[PDB]
């Protein structure tokens, strides 16, 4: 049923996952020395390629492969369109490893045909809290804590095979060669997410959307007018009214984040992310990289009164291509990123997120039900979308957890 995934060090079924009680590796410990020095064999018409991301033309080639061939919704109406500026930001965090960005080009023309990217992440991934309770009841605390310390692993994203190359078992060859390159740097675990079911997730969560520009959403058929609104003389006018927002933020000390805020934002974020079983650990340089505002890419605001940063939120932009509509070419979506509240309720902090995103011209705000994203779904008028996002590890046994125990945002 799975010719590739059945050969890989991942839990194979749900009931296998069910017998997992401690975090730890699936496979045999291995060394760099054991790993083949040479690239995995490939068909003689293709060649491996390592793009240079601090070079404009290389970023542009991967930008076009993704523009034309990356994730679509299920009836081919929208396709993600990550910008070039976004891709440099996402692929090049501090101390990234250039050879973990893995491409396949056609030899004859150098046309990009496939891509996969890995980046460093420091991740807490020790036995979850509920399994530590079950462990103490059994007398098994030591085995439960063996992998408690944060691990330097790989986060995978941007797997893409050209449309003309689909269903030829190319994705396995990409994944094998990524795994070899990661293993050649003495890294043995990866974390990845997908909107498809594979063997075998450790957590799953629904998608959620908050309409900001409802007349445009209905026009492009992102949204419909729901049935209930027909009882009204003017269904659309009442839909606009339901989703209207203030013009300016409600929290008085709200302002954009600046370099001097890095230490306080790091502090309050890390204190918050501690409450979750699987969560990233960020250095000052990584807080700077992922949170300081960047035009058209990432937007981050702090609440400061009395010269302390006590709360913040962030969101990132990804436009999607509207696969041809007469009036509109692009859906401009804002995605909830990291946040922390210490002085005001989480709903009151995120309302300011919606208000900023709306004033800056975003059409919809999107998020998965990770972190504490549930505490504000009803009052802030988010709705559940279609399907689920699934979270996975590579070479890591892990007890099933709820998505509200997951704190890793995947860009
Ligand atoms: C220690 C370091 C390790 C690092 C690596 C860790 C693992 C990283 C894993 C990657 C995490 C990526 C996270 C993301 O970026 S999720 C985003 C994935 N990208 C898209 O959905 C973009 C549009 N679609 C495509 O570009 C292609 O359809 C892709 C590339 C997805 C598949 O290409 P194609 O359709 O031409 O198929 P094939 O004949 O070549 O290959 C068929 C095999 O591929 C398995 N398949 C299908 N979809 C996925 C998927 N999303 N993750 C893992 N495997 C997937 C499938 O079950 C089958 O195996 P098996 O069932 O026969 O066994
Ligand atoms: O899991 C990932 C990264 C993964 O390798 C590739 C992927 C891209 C899109 C989707 Cl659909 C699923 C998986 N995501 C990237 C998406 C954009 O940041 C993010 C998302 C958030 C909220 C909504 Cl409502 C929809 C999507 C999920
Ligand atoms: Mg293929």
């Amino acid at each position: 049923a799975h010719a590739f995934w059945s050969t890989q060090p991942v839990p194979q079924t749900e009931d296998e996952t069910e017998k997992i009680v401690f975090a730890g590796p699936m496979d045999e410990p291995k060394t760099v020395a054991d790993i083949p020095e040479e690239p995995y064999p490939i068909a003689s018409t293709f060649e491996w390629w390592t793009p240079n991301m601090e070079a404009a033309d290389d970023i542009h080639a991967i930008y076009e492969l993704l523009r034309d061939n990356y994730v679509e919704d299920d009836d081919s109406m929208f396709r993600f369109n990550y910008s070039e500026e976004f891709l440099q930001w996402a692929l090049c965090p501090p101390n990234y490893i250039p050879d973990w960005h893995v491409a396949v080009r056609r030899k004859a023309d150098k046309k990009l045909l496939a891509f996969i990217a890995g980046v460093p992440v420091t991740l807490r991934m020790g036995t979850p809290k509920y399994m530590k309770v079950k462990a103490q009841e059994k007398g098994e605390g030591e085995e439960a804590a063996k992998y408690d310390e944060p691990r330097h692993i790989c986060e995978i994203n941007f797997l893409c095979v050209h449309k003309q190359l689909r269903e030829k078992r190319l994705a396995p060859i990409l994944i094998k060669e990524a795994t070899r390159r990661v293993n050649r740097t003495n890294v043995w675990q990866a974390v990845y997410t997908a909107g498809v079911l594979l063997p075998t997730p450790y957590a799953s969560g629904q998608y959620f959307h908050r309409s900001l520009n409802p007349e445009k959403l209905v026009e492009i058929r992102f949204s419909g007018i729901p049935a209930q609104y027909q009882k009204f003389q003017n269904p659309m006018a009442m839909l606009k009214r339901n989703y209207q927002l203030p013009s300016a933020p409600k929290n008085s000390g709200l302002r954009e984040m600046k370099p001097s805020d890095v230490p306080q934002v790091r502090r309050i974020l890390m204190n918050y992310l501690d409450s979750f079983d699987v969560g990233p650990v960020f250095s000052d340089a990584e807080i700077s990289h992922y949170l300081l505002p960047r035009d058209g890419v990432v937007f981050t605001y702090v609440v400061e009164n009395d010269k302390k940063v006590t709360d913040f939120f962030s969101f990132y932009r990804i436009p999607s291509t509207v696969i041809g509509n007469s009036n509109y070419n692009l859906l401009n979506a804002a995605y909830v990123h990291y946040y922390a509240a210490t002085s005001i309720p989480l709903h009151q902090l995120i309302l300011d997120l919606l208000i900023v995103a709306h004033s800056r011209g975003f059409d919809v705000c999107n998020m998965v039900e990770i972190l504490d994203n549930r505490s504000f779904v009803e009052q802030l008028k988010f709705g559940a979308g279609d399907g689920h996002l699934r979270y996975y590890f590579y070479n890591w046994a892990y007890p099933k957890i709820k998505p509200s125990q997951v704190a890793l945002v995947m860009l």
Side-chain angles (χ1 to χ4, degrees):
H2 300 287
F4 167 71
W5 282 111
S6 79
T7 73
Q8 291 309 106
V10 296
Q12 216 58 4
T13 66
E14 287 287 332
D15 253 36
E16 160 172 12
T17 294
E18 230 282 335
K19 320 314 185 178
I20 310 173
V21 303
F22 306 131
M26 303 284 297
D27 246 2
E28 44 154 14
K30 285 213 224 166
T31 75
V32 176
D34 301 307
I35 310 296
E37 288 172 349
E38 294 309 310
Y40 198 80
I42 204 182
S44 44
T45 24
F46 305 140
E47 75 194 359
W48 295 111
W49 178 47
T50 301
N52 176 10
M53 262 79 215
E54 318 203 280
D57 179 67
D58 291 12
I59 299 158
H60 185 268
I62 309 305
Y63 160 76
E64 89 190 26
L65 175 73
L66 304 172
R67 183 191 65 206
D68 297 338
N69 307 274
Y70 202 45
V71 175
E72 291 171 21
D73 67 82
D74 39 49
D75 300 303
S76 288
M77 303 166 41
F78 314 97
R79 181 157 58 240
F80 286 85
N81 190 11
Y82 289 88
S83 69
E84 289 165 94
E85 290 88 345
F86 194 110
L87 293 163
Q88 194 156 359
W89 171 61
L91 296 186
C92 301
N95 307 302
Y96 82 101
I97 308 289
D99 87 309
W100 289 11
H101 303 154
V102 183
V104 176
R105 305 193 289 188
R106 192 163 43 213
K107 279 185 158 162
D109 47 9
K110 288 160 154 69
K111 181 199 183 57
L112 195 57
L113 299 179
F115 179 76
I116 192 174
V119 298
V121 67
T122 310
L123 205 65
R124 282 188 307 116
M125 58 201 289
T127 303
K129 282 175 285 295
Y130 87 95
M131 280 302 306
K132 269 196 190 229
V133 172
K134 287 312 282 108
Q136 288 281 125
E137 288 165 2
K138 279 235 293 177
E140 306 189 312
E142 206 149 12
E143 294 120 67
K146 174 173 204 184
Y147 298 103
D148 276 2
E149 284 293 290
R151 292 176 75 80
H152 304 265
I153 63 160
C154 174
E155 175 186 311
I156 292 277
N157 202 345
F158 304 110
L159 172 63
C160 191
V161 165
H162 197 280
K163 282 173 173 216
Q164 295 176 137
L165 281 141
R166 295 281 176 89
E167 308 178 278
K168 301 178 180 306
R169 315 299 304 176
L170 195 53
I173 306 172
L174 272 179
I175 291 155
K176 282 149 161 185
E177 175 64 10
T179 297
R180 189 196 65 86
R181 301 181 185 198
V182 175
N183 289 169
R184 292 290 292 168
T185 69
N186 199 38
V187 171
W188 307 94
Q189 279 76 43
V191 59
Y192 53 105
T193 51
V196 295
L197 189 67
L198 298 172
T200 300
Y202 71 85
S204 188
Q206 289 186 279
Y207 300 108
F208 288 84
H209 314 289
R210 205 287 183 183
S211 166
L212 309 175
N213 179 0
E215 184 153 33
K216 177 169 172 180
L217 307 174
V218 166
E219 181 43 69
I220 77 194
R221 321 257 304 309
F222 181 88
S223 286
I225 302 195
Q228 286 272 43
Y229 280 85
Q230 290 310 317
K231 81 196 171 167
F232 300 126
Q233 193 294 142
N234 190 328
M236 179 60 71
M238 289 302 289
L239 190 72
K240 296 167 66 184
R241 222 153 63 44
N242 168 245
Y243 285 120
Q244 84 190 88
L245 287 161
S247 300
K250 285 326 205 202
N251 299 99
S252 80
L254 195 78
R255 55 157 177 87
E256 275 186 319
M257 185 183 176
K258 66 195 159 150
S260 57
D261 297 322
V262 164
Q264 283 178 282
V265 169
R266 181 174 80 161
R267 181 170 318 132
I268 67 173
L269 188 52
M270 288 302 92
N271 181 70
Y272 178 48
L273 295 199
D274 270 339
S275 61
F276 301 91
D277 301 314
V278 167
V281 179
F282 292 133
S283 69
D284 277 359
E286 292 165 333
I287 292 291
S288 292
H289 181 83
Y290 282 115
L291 302 179
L292 281 182
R294 296 193 182 201
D295 293 344
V297 178
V298 62
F299 301 77
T300 306
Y301 291 73
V302 296
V303 176
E304 173 176 75
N305 1 64
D306 210 37
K307 325 197 189 78
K308 262 162 79 261
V309 171
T310 54
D311 318 86
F312 88 97
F313 67 73
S314 177
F315 62 95
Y316 60 86
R317 168 170 183 268
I318 310 164
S320 292
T321 300
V322 177
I323 301 176
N325 173 268
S326 74
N327 301 266
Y328 293 109
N329 274 211
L330 238 40
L331 160 75
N332 192 24
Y335 288 81
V336 180
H337 195 203
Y338 297 103
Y339 54 78
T342 73
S343 95
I344 55 176
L346 176 64
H347 69 78
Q348 180 176 342
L349 178 65
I350 303 307
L351 172 61
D352 274 358
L353 187 159
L354 301 181
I355 286 171
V356 171
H358 170 264
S359 286
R360 291 187 178 262
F362 292 86
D363 300 317
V364 67
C365 180
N366 292 331
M367 71 181 179
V368 179
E369 59 170 326
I370 58 167
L371 297 164
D372 287 318
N373 289 347
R374 296 281 315 272
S375 71
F376 56 80
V377 164
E378 312 68 15
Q379 51 271 63
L380 293 186
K381 288 184 173 172
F382 289 74
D386 300 297
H388 298 73
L389 188 67
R390 273 91 170 195
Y391 271 83
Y392 303 97
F393 295 119
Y394 183 91
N395 189 36
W396 200 251
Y398 203 80
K400 193 76 91 180
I401 48 175
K402 283 194 232 296
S404 60
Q405 284 293 332
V406 171
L408 183 63
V409 177
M410 298 288 305
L411 294 172

